[PDB]
Symmetry: C5
């Protein structure tokens, strides 16, 4: 009212919302941890042959050591150090995901989710936070869930909303545990504060559409995490309950 | 007494000038932003694309905040490209250092009634949404879930009791926003957290730019103030929640 | 036994010169500011805009502190322009590093009786005012709601308990100030907080720059002392309140 | 339903090569140091002084750790000179960043039977020695009070319960060391403490450089294992005492 | 077994030279200062201003510590100007980097008996004076309220149990000083801060520079030890106080 600027503010408020375009903007700008297609393309293009061989290796590193290439290269066998650093030069691996284009080894593992989670369980005895830590909270925690990549495999279609919620709570057990075990800064945070530090990445993975739900459900059934009826395992239901109970 | 000592004393014998001083106080009192300068800049720069460009900036502020570069690595390709472009185009910055610093949130703050309505329509997208609020109160007004709602609390055409409830109701989200989003506030009391936002909120409320005669109408239309001029039920329960830690 | 050990042994054998020592201690003691240094600089640099300039600088100190650049980003453009102008005009700084360092607050401290009177006149604009204070005690004396008040407590013309009591009342505000305003010292003990301000508070009180015959007269004329030279009701309560954690 | 999506899927559809994988995991597994790399550098560079030089470094590592420069300003003048000489002479560094980095503590780890032997002799000089271990357990084996003892725990020629006990006894010191010395670990949980050394411990216990037959025969000679091949009273009680938080 | 592996094996089958090792350990153990060095530097550099110069330096150390520049900006002009001159004059540093670092406190520690006397005479000027210790203990010995006291604690000329009482009585001031002055030390257990001073204290007490016979005689001349060579009432009380957390 008072100035032309004041009136402009008021009239801008008088407008009517376009709910279809506001939504688009919202999703356009919504959190996103990675573009799996860009990482797979970068990888396959860069290494022609020897890209499946080279990628897997990057995934075992991510699974067992994280993103910290340089510190890690100094604390490993010579051949593993040698190859790791070779692959870093070769793919331009970075230790921190600054932009959409930055290839961290954990982004690599998150981009091939069903291979990673399978490798996780085969290697459960090498994971930084595996059966030891998990088993003393629940009997038989599904080892495929012991990695950053498992959230991409929780489905949102072909299962009940309750099933999807169970899988997230169960998975949160390991998320919360990994964080505490691994993150120095996070030590002493309430259960909610731990949660928030991973709310967004887990959501973006779940509600992502790159890895198709029908493939998820089948994988889940095949691993026993869902029964044939499409509802969680015993172990999942407990892990979920455990997590709801702190 | 040295010559100086004697000056110091004679300086406190002077009569106070209560208008001089008040004027001084207000001129130096914390000020959140110049919305006028912000709107003028966006319009003069954008031409007519400014109205859409703004809405797009406001949605960014609503769901991502101010950290443009960090957030551009964590979105879609369309979002990121458009956002970087709007930044280059308008001179957008991530920190509100000076009065001329155009931050996404300050843009949101300079078009209040749109932002809140957008926030409510985009409520499921907010970093502190109904997921958070509901654990504290059933039916938290979604128009209160954003940084811009502060400008809409009126101080004229409602009682200072109505005003105060709207601010306590609002302080519930201010609290949860801070505690949820920024690490430097872990294990901090309800009086420390309030203090981290005392200054901006009191300045938002007592801003003269966005007029109170519209604030009351808009609140009414949005059911946060009833027709009798008093808060809704959802507000009163929200105030009560905050009053009780 | 040889021969530096001998020098050491023989060194400790000497008789102390208690005066030598006590003078060394006074020279090396904490000192917060040379008020005369301050006032002299202001009066030489600014001519007579100096009396106006100081008030306005003091109001800045009383309501926003020492943070010249951050504050100026967050205030009316009028206030912002005169602040940066006065900074350059007087070489105002943000941190006291040397005795030469002229900060707003030190300026505030160099004209005590004016500062506390304006603190009183502008209670509602203080970052720690009657709001925070009434949650502690009924009627907390407003003149004590600033950094300047310490300089006004008497070490002569009153009983030593009177002095102890004024300082105990004051530490209510001091403690409140720090906790409310220091980002560090958040989960910190009472004495820990007290230790953050003992040395300056003690230095301020024991200062010889501002005469006690004026302090007592002013304190009585403000009612913080009664005519018999003893604390008021609300001062006695404030001490006990500080005493009682 | 995308080119790249279809790639991810059939990718995750591959059979694992459990041997491919086991090998990658081991290659990428945490490795504390390459003792063979270490010995070979000390012996190529040291010629024959190497033995007596190594002994001196191992002694500094045992009693001051790895912080060469800071420690040299706080010791005797001769020991300080000899420190800095051996540093230039062998490229001794303070942090183990690469596999090539030669730290005193690493040097010590590369010769664990000597190191643990000489640690028991130097028990009164150890940062964490018999005073701390006696407030926890009767008769803590002195050979254990060092970073090198982990390598001496065997996985071959003893029961796998023997091994667990030996790791549990040892963790008592390990836990005490980190709490005593690491300013960060202060006020952390027992688990939080165990994690910071779980990895290097398992790598040491599981290394193949220093042979299990020799580890066992040595521990027999030191009575950390009785003739049967099972723990000592002290190991057993020390084990139990670590277990009980 | 093979092949560098075999070197590490035979390296550990080498007999221990306990003469070699004990020497190494002493050369390498913690040392706080060559006080002879310090006195030597001061006498040669200063001729006879040297005696009065040191006295002044020590008063500085006692009441303000080692931070020359920071403190010189918060004292009288007189004291600031003399302090800086002495720093240029003597090459004074604020931090104890190497054995040649002559810090104020290090000067105080080089002339222990003088310092503790000076400390007791200036007890009210000390950063941790009676105000602190008087709450903890009735009549805490003022000579112990400084860093130099530990060199005075005797190891010979008195019983082992007497010594432990002094080290314990003293630690009460040690504990108090560290907690009350170092912020990084806040929120920390008793053992965490004891460790903070354990090495320096041990190094002082066990030093051979200052002869034990003087220590005892001097302790006696102050009533810290009675004529039979035993701790005072104040001594045993303060020790009890310290063992009782």
């Amino acid at each position: 009212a008072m100035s032309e600027w004041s009136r402009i503010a008021v009239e801008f408020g008088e407008q009517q919302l376009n709910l279809t375009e506001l939504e688009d903007f919202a999703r356009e700008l919504a959190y996103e941890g990675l573009d799996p297609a860009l990482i797979i393309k970068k990888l396959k293009e860069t290494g022609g042959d020897d890209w499946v061989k080279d990628t897997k290796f990057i995934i075992v590193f991510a699974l067992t050591r994280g993103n910290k290439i340089v510190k890690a290269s100094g604390k490993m066998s010579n051949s593993g150090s040698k190859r790791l650093m070779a692959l870093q030069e070769k793919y331009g691996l970075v230790e921190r995901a600054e932009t959409r284009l930055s290839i961290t080894p954990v982004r690599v593992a998150q981009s091939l989710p069903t291979w990673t989670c399978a490798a996780a369980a085969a290697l459960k005895e090498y994971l930084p936070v595996g059966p030891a830590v998990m088993n003393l909270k629940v009997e038989n925690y599904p080892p495929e869930m012991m990695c950053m990549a498992f959230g991409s495999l929780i489905p949102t279609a072909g299962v009940s909303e309750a099933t999807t919620k169970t899988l997230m709570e169960a998975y949160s057990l390991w998320q919360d545990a990994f964080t505490k075990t691994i993150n120095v800064k996070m030590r002493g945070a309430s259960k909610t504060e731990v949660y928030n530090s991973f709310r967004d990445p887990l959501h973006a993975a779940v509600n992502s559409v790159f890895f198709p739900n029908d493939v998820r459900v089948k994988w889940l059934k095949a691993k026993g995490i869902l029964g044939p009826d499409g509802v969680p395992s015993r172990a999942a239901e407990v892990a979920a309950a455990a997590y709801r109970n702190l």
